[PDB]
Design a protein around this motif. Structure first.
Motif, PDB file in Angstrom:
ATOM      1  N   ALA A  90      -4.489   3.483  -5.956  1.00  0.00           N
ATOM      2  CA  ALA A  90      -5.574   3.954  -5.079  1.00  0.00           C
ATOM      3  C   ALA A  90      -6.823   3.104  -5.340  1.00  0.00           C
ATOM      4  O   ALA A  90      -6.818   2.098  -6.074  1.00  0.00           O
ATOM      5  N   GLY A  91      -7.906   3.464  -4.645  1.00  0.00           N
ATOM      6  CA  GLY A  91      -9.189   2.757  -4.824  1.00  0.00           C
ATOM      7  C   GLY A  91      -9.035   1.308  -4.474  1.00  0.00           C
ATOM      8  O   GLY A  91      -8.445   0.975  -3.443  1.00  0.00           O
ATOM      9  N   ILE A  92      -9.560   0.429  -5.311  1.00  0.00           N
ATOM     10  CA  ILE A  92      -9.575  -1.026  -5.014  1.00  0.00           C
ATOM     11  C   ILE A  92      -8.187  -1.642  -5.077  1.00  0.00           C
ATOM     12  O   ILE A  92      -8.065  -2.835  -4.671  1.00  0.00           O
ATOM     13  N   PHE A  93      -7.124  -0.912  -5.458  1.00  0.00           N
ATOM     14  CA  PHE A  93      -5.753  -1.448  -5.338  1.00  0.00           C
ATOM     15  C   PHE A  93      -5.221  -1.301  -3.911  1.00  0.00           C
ATOM     16  O   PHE A  93      -4.129  -1.829  -3.671  1.00  0.00           O
ATOM     17  N   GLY A  94      -5.890  -0.587  -3.041  1.00  0.00           N
ATOM     18  CA  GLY A  94      -5.603  -0.760  -1.600  1.00  0.00           C
ATOM     19  C   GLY A  94      -4.538   0.148  -1.047  1.00  0.00           C
ATOM     20  O   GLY A  94      -4.303   0.066   0.200  1.00  0.00           O
ATOM     21  N   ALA A  95      -3.825   0.952  -1.824  1.00  0.00           N
ATOM     22  CA  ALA A  95      -2.781   1.821  -1.260  1.00  0.00           C
ATOM     23  C   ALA A  95      -3.413   3.076  -0.686  1.00  0.00           C
ATOM     24  O   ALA A  95      -4.515   3.427  -1.014  1.00  0.00           O
ATOM     25  N   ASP A  96      -2.639   3.764   0.140  1.00  0.00           N
ATOM     26  CA  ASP A  96      -3.039   5.087   0.677  1.00  0.00           C
ATOM     27  C   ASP A  96      -2.962   6.128  -0.438  1.00  0.00           C
ATOM     28  O   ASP A  96      -1.860   6.353  -0.967  1.00  0.00           O
ATOM     29  N   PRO A  97      -4.061   6.750  -0.870  1.00  0.00           N
ATOM     30  CA  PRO A  97      -3.981   7.744  -1.940  1.00  0.00           C
ATOM     31  C   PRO A  97      -3.091   8.955  -1.651  1.00  0.00           C
ATOM     32  O   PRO A  97      -2.549   9.556  -2.566  1.00  0.00           O
ATOM     33  N   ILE A  98      -2.945   9.312  -0.365  1.00  0.00           N
ATOM     34  CA  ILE A  98      -2.045  10.417   0.017  1.00  0.00           C
ATOM     35  C   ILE A  98      -0.617  10.027  -0.367  1.00  0.00           C
ATOM     36  O   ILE A  98       0.148  10.847  -0.882  1.00  0.00           O
ATOM     37  N   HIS A  99      -0.230   8.801  -0.038  1.00  0.00           N
ATOM     38  CA  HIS A  99       1.086   8.269  -0.436  1.00  0.00           C
ATOM     39  C   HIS A  99       1.204   8.257  -1.968  1.00  0.00           C
ATOM     40  O   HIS A  99       2.257   8.651  -2.473  1.00  0.00           O
ATOM     41  N   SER A 100       0.213   7.778  -2.646  1.00  0.00           N
ATOM     42  CA  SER A 100       0.261   7.725  -4.123  1.00  0.00           C
ATOM     43  C   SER A 100       0.516   9.113  -4.712  1.00  0.00           C
ATOM     44  O   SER A 100       1.341   9.254  -5.637  1.00  0.00           O
ATOM     45  N   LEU A 101      -0.171  10.136  -4.195  1.00  0.00           N
ATOM     46  CA  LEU A 101       0.032  11.505  -4.710  1.00  0.00           C
ATOM     47  C   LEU A 101       1.464  11.950  -4.424  1.00  0.00           C
ATOM     48  O   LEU A 101       2.092  12.586  -5.301  1.00  0.00           O
ATOM     49  N   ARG A 102       2.014  11.657  -3.258  1.00  0.00           N
ATOM     50  CA  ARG A 102       3.395  12.053  -2.959  1.00  0.00           C
ATOM     51  C   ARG A 102       4.370  11.388  -3.940  1.00  0.00           C
ATOM     52  O   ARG A 102       5.266  12.042  -4.474  1.00  0.00           O
ATOM     53  N   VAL A 103       4.203  10.077  -4.169  1.00  0.00           N
ATOM     54  CA  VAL A 103       5.107   9.368  -5.109  1.00  0.00           C
ATOM     55  C   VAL A 103       4.939   9.987  -6.498  1.00  0.00           C
ATOM     56  O   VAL A 103       5.932  10.174  -7.192  1.00  0.00           O
ATOM     57  N   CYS A 104       3.727  10.297  -6.915  1.00  0.00           N
ATOM     58  CA  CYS A 104       3.491  10.921  -8.225  1.00  0.00           C
ATOM     59  C   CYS A 104       4.305  12.210  -8.333  1.00  0.00           C
ATOM     60  O   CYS A 104       5.065  12.409  -9.279  1.00  0.00           O
ATOM     61  N   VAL A 105       4.146  13.100  -7.359  1.00  0.00           N
ATOM     62  CA  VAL A 105       4.815  14.409  -7.416  1.00  0.00           C
ATOM     63  C   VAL A 105       6.318  14.215  -7.417  1.00  0.00           C
ATOM     64  O   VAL A 105       7.013  15.009  -8.076  1.00  0.00           O
TER      65      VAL A 105
END
Length: 167
Positions: free
Chosen positions: A127-142
């Motif tokens: 997320a942030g300056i790494f440019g990915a969609d944070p919503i996607h990041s949270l889904r992959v985390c879960v």
């Protein structure tokens, strides 16, 4: 029971809070804080720059010695170093940087590193300056992390959108 306070429970094992990960680390002194690292452990900006600044640059000094000995990390990889004044340990995890054109499928591999630790304080990878969609990041985390993860989200607007949109 543990020292983490004010988190919303998303799943059996994933918790989230609008908080500055630096201020959270200073309060809790978790066993593990996760850094949003790059392969060179150059902690210039984003979460990494903030964590490193809070250690008075000791994180960067330690990291430079690690790279001189071991060479760069892999995208999707990690290393365990000192947590300095913030935590017992820092797990430096390299999520893919979309602004460098890295494969977003490597985000799952990045989160798999969390499973080697029973409890972690962490940011959303990529997320942030790494440019990915944070919503996607949270889904992959879960869907990837099985150990107990306490996610700190700096931006209040983004925090509210992550909670409201969480399936």
């Amino acid at each position: 029971v543990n020292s983490f306070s004010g988190y919303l429970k998303l799943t059996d094992n994933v918790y989230i809070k609008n908080a500055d990960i630096v201020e959270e680390a200073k309060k809790v002194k978790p066993t593990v804080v996760v850094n949003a690292a790059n392969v060179y452990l150059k902690h210039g900006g984003g979460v990494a720059g903030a964590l490193n600044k809070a250690t008075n640059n000791a994180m960067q000094v330690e990291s430079d010695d690690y790279i001189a000995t071991n060479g760069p990390l892999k995208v999707g990889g990690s290393c365990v170093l000192s947590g300095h004044n913030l935590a017992k340990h820092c797990l430096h995890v390299v999520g893919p940087n979309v602004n460098k054109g890295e494969d977003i499928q490597l985000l799952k591999s990045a989160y798999e590193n969390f499973n080697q630790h029973e409890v972690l304080l962490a940011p959303l990878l990529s997320a942030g300056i790494f440019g990915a969609d944070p919503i996607h990041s949270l889904r992959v985390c879960v869907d990837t992390v099985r150990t107990n993860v306490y996610l700190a989200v700096f931006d209040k607007n983004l925090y509210d959108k992550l909670v409201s949109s969480f399936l």
